[PDB]
Structures are given as C-alpha cells and as structure tokens.
Amino acid sequence: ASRLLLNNGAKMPILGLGTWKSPPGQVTEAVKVAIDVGYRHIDCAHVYQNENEVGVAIQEKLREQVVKREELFIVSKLWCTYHEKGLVKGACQKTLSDLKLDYLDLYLIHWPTGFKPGKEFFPLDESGNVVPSDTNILDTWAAMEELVDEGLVKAIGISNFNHLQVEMILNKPGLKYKPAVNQIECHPYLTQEKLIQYCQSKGIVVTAYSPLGSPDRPWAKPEDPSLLEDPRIKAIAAKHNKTTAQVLIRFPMQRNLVVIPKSVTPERIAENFKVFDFELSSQDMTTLLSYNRNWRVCALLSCTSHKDYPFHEEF
Ligand SMILES: NC(=O)c1ccc[n+]([C@@H]2O[C@H](COP(=O)([O-])OP(=O)(O)OC[C@H]3O[C@@H](n4cnc5c(N)ncnc54)[C@H](OP(=O)(O)O)[C@@H]3O)[C@@H](O)[C@H]2O)c1
C-alpha cells in the first residue's frame, strides 16, 4: 500500500516530502499544498532552520481537520552538536516545540559523528577543522532509547550509518529498541545494493534521500552529472508517459524503499505524488540499477578524519 510496516508496529507512508533547503518563507505553503495533495509524511531536521514554519503548516491542516494527527508521520533528526547523553532530550523538545507537536513518529540520529556542543552547527578549531565530541554511537543510542520510554517519540532510527555502525547498535548489550529506519542517499548513480540488502535482512526499513540527485545542493559544481537530464532516464520516462522525476521517485518505491523528494513548488509537489499509478518493468529496474557510479551528493567532506566518519567502509 503507500505504507511500510516498521518494527514498532507503525506503518510509514512510502512517499514523504523533504524540507532541506526549503526557505522559511516558502515551506509553510509547500507543506500545506503537500497535505492537501495527499502527502502524509514530512521529513524534517533542526539543522534545516525551518521547523517552526513547517509546524505552522501542520497546525493549520490539523485545525482545518484535513488530517488527524494519527494519520500524519512526522520525522526529525538529532543534529551532531547534541550527541551527548544529557543534550538529546533538550534537542528533541526544541524540535517538538518548533513543530508544535507533542510526539514525533520517528526521530533519527542525523550523522554518526558527534561535534562539540555549542551554537555553531559545524564548530571549527579556532582555525580549521570541525571540532569532534568524544561521545560514541552507543552513548547516543542509549539517550535515544530514553525518548521512547518517555513518550516523546514513537520510533528511533539512524541516518548515514554504514553497515558496521548499524551492527554496532545491533550488538549493544541490553539493546532495548532496534533502529527502525536507516535513512541514506540513494538514486541511479549511488544504488546502495549492499547496504540496502544488509538493512532489509535485519528488518530495518531504508529511506532514500536525494532521489532526484539534489539539483539545488549548495556545492553543486561538478558540471556533470544530472539525473533529471540523463537522456537514458528521459527515454524510460517517455516510454511510460511519465516525467523523469516520476520515474526517479517510482524506482526506490519498487525496491521497497521509502522516498522523500523535496519541492517547494506546488506543481512539482503535485507531480511527484502521481507515482502510485504505474509500474517500472523488471527490465527498466535492472537498467536503472546499471547506472550506478558510486556518486554521492552528501559526503560530509569536512569530517573525513572524524573517528566516526561513515564513508571509508565499502558499505
Ligand atoms: N538525512 C540526511 O542526511 C539527508 C540529506 C539530504 C537530504 N535529506 C532529505 O531528503 C530530502 C530530499 O533530498 P534533497 O533535498 O537533497 O533533493 P531532491 O529531492 O533529490 O531534489 C530536490 C530538488 O529537485 C527539484 N524538484 C522536485 N521535484 C521536481 C520535479 N518534479 N521536477 C523537477 N525538479 C524537481 C526541487 O526543486 P523545487 O524545490 O524548486 O521544486 C529541488 O531543486 C531532503 O529535502 C531532506 O528532507 C536527508
């Protein structure tokens, strides 16, 4: 159906709306339009600096009775400067205040890397590199498990964890709640077959972020590759009378992945929803998988020496 069953018994909508880089001034309208169109899952984060304005839209639609809270699935993420056991709750309560909710459906550790606490999201060492915290992943997972026992979040997960870091949590002595979700970058140029196969075999649901290749990412140099413009993907979409974006959103769905395209444009938010009415053939799916080139949009390049940097491992 549009929902995948989580290990806590909840069902997660397979399509959600992303909000990274959605400006405060445009995201309230964008989330309102998305809920009107039929979106029931919104992906958020403290570091996107727009959760208050996302929260204005959810309140509006709740008040309107367009949707009840139980049918919404709201996701946010713990930023790297809040990995200390004593800061996790406070970070979650700030997000809950900004979103004006009393619980989150899913809360994710945004990156495995902890940074020193403070007001800068990427603290620098007077001079140059990002200043790390000495916290580790298991300390932060224990603080996340407390949030479930206190009723603030219904499920907890991870994002950008490689398979060894997931295995580290899965083997934690006294593990009380397994990660429900691992949210990772995934699209035809970074197909992630080994990490998806690992997670799915452990009962962890995978969410594909940057499904369209994030054409608005700030560091967009390469002058090269664009997924939306790839003539080979345009040809598959033409065969189905769909747009390239609709093919790129349908592709993770047929791999049993949740997918969270971002848009602040009403026509594209609506376009992106019309993805339940067609099917990519096996041939189309094998062809899209063959375009992998291990190209990653989000490589957290300022942290390549951090003890917990996730992308040195094969997967
Ligand atoms: N956990 C993490 O580390 C992490 C990292 C990155 C992203 N994410 C999540 O994943 C979400 C999606 O990834 P993303 O924001 O990197 O990028 P994306 O969804 O791959 O691409 C967004 C870009 O595509 C455009 N777009 C959307 N629909 C389109 C369509 N039908 N036709 C043409 N262009 C279209 C958007 O334009 P307009 O907005 O102008 O329409 C925007 O410029 C994020 O917003 C965030 O919620 C999570």
Asked whether 245 and 228 are in contact (CB, 8 A), the reply is: yes
What resolution in angstroms, rounded to 1 decimal? 1.6
**Separation of 22 CA from ligand 1 center, angstroms?**
9
Active-site positions read 48
DSSP one-letter code for 131: P
Return the SS3 of 104.
strand
* First vs last C-alpha separation in the chain: 29
| CA-CA-CA-CA torsion sign (166, 167, 168, 170) | positive
Phi-psi region of 100 (alpha: psi -120 to 50; beta: other; left: phi over 0): left
- Residue 7, token pair as written in the block: 């290990």
Does ligand 1 have an atom closer than 6 angstroms to the CB of 43? yes
| CA-CA-CA-CA torsion sign (232, 300, 44, 157) | positive
Q: How far apart are CA 81 and CA 169, in angstroms?
A: 20
In the chain, what are the domains?
Answer: 1-315 (3.20.20.100)
**Separation of 222 CA from ligand 1 center, angstroms?**
17
Dihedral angle at the C-alpha atoms of 45, 99, 78, 292, nearest 10 degrees? -30
Nearest CA to 178 among 208, 139, 148, 136?
Answer: 148
Q: Could you tell me which residues come within 8 angstroms of residue 92 by beta carbon, excluding any fewer than 6 positions away?
A: 76, 78, 104, 107, 147, 152, 153
φ/ψ of 241, rounded to 5, equals 55, 45
To test ligand 1's pocket by mutation, which of 251, 262, 269 has the most ligand atoms within 8 angstroms of CB? 262
User: C-alpha 101: how far from its chain's center?
Assistant: 19
Does ligand 1 have an atom closer than 6 angstroms to the CB of 19? yes
Residue identified by tokens 């490589």 is 299
Does ligand 1 have an atom closer than 6 angstroms to the CB of 189? no
- Residue 92, token pair as written in the block: 């979650």
Nearest CA to 161 among 88, 91, 201, 109?
Answer: 109
φ/ψ of 3, rounded to 5, equals -140, 145
Binding site annotation covers 228? yes
Asked whether 109 and 144 are in contact (CB, 8 A), the reply is: yes
Does ligand 1 have an atom closer than 6 angstroms to the CB of 39? no
